[PDB]
Design a protein around this ligand. Sequence first.
Ligand SMILES: Nc1ncnc2c1nc(Sc1cc3c(cc1I)OCO3)n2CCCCCC[PH](c1ccccc1)(c1ccccc1)c1ccccc1
Length: 432
Amino acid sequence: PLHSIISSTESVQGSTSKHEFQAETKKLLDIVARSLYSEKEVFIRELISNASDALEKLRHKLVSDGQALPEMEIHLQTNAEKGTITIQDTGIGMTQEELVSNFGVGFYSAFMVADRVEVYSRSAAPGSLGYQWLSDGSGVFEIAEASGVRTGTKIIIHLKSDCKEFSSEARVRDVVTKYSNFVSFPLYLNGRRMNTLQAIWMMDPKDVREWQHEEFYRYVAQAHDKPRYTLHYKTDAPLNIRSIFYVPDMKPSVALYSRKVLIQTKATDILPKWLRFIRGVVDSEDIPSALIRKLRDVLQQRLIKFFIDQSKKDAEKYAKFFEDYGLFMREGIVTATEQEVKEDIAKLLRYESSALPSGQLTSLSEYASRMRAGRNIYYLCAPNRHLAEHSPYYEAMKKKDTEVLFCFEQFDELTLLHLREFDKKKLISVET
Ligand SMILES: Nc1ncnc2c1nc(Sc1cc3c(cc1I)OCO3)n2CCCCCC[PH](c1ccccc1)(c1ccccc1)c1ccccc1
């Protein structure tokens, strides 16, 4: 059964007071209309966003007053013959003052694809009047008092003669499923429900449980396994961040959202290249490939700290993790620039030692703890534990009461060599 809300109930009795766009608003209007977004199809996205916030404020208000909740829904409709696309929401509306004046600039994106825009809106405030708002992208909009306007906002877009594609149910479905699959209010396209997914990264980390994480993981990783690691990172402090990061059970990307709406699917430069094995999502208000940097840096710091924490609370699990993904960590160490970056990532490294039984691992930072003040870090990055336990260059350190690290692969040694020093303090093989 079809669930539609959109019908033409509106009528304007009197006439329209014409209104000129102010200098500043007309400018930015034009720049949104032809110089702000790259893709045409994000007008649907931004409009849905505005509908979402309208519904959210209606809800917040009604629940605050303790009054019942009505249908809080976003409805989209396409009309091929009349060449339109309509988006209606039962949210909070706009007063006359707001319509005349006017998060929420996104609305003007409508003019990238439209030759005429027709909007009906009635505020949720008691005893409110509905209003019509007309514009053609010029400096002039008409305004009128209308009737047959349901509470909430109705936006009818008349499409440019070449922008007609967004009057097809298919294309619009694809755009909606691509950008707004996590919108927090029910969304209908020509009567059919669309969004079914829950932006669990906005939830409170304690309120999410493994089945949800596995679901979302198999969504954003396009995978069929489970995450061996899950970080749920929220911060308002230096920058607004709502992110979830997964490390697959499998052995060998991150999506960029903002305000629960998609911006970048294969959001590449959000993380260091050595963390490109991580799966998941990052949501931040602060996103419009020029400066996404201070984001990448604190995501790197946080993630590194996470893998360290995980090191301390489970060691064999982190051991297997180091076996399966230590490649990326070595690579990232060699690829870095500043020493303390290299050492930050180096804090994720695990190798055998003289003092530990065969298989037991430590990091550079750790058993530099029996290490008496000076001094230096020595290693021997051999082919075998046996062959290194009874290697001449090593017993040169056996009873000179000193600790020696054991590598068994060349890439470990090359990495250690490039590292040169860790914590002001140098690394050199016992073969020199
Ligand atoms: N679907 C929607 N439902 C409700 N409101 C919506 C909405 N879509 C938009 S975006 C939009 C849509 C339009 C339009 C101009 C705009 I911008 O013309 C026709 O259709 N708004 C707008 C809501 C967001 C704008 C906030 C209003 P303002 C304000 C300030 C002074 C005088 C009038 C209005 C406001 C008022 C009280 C509390 C919070 C915010 C405001 C705040 C900050 C910067 C600018 C405007």
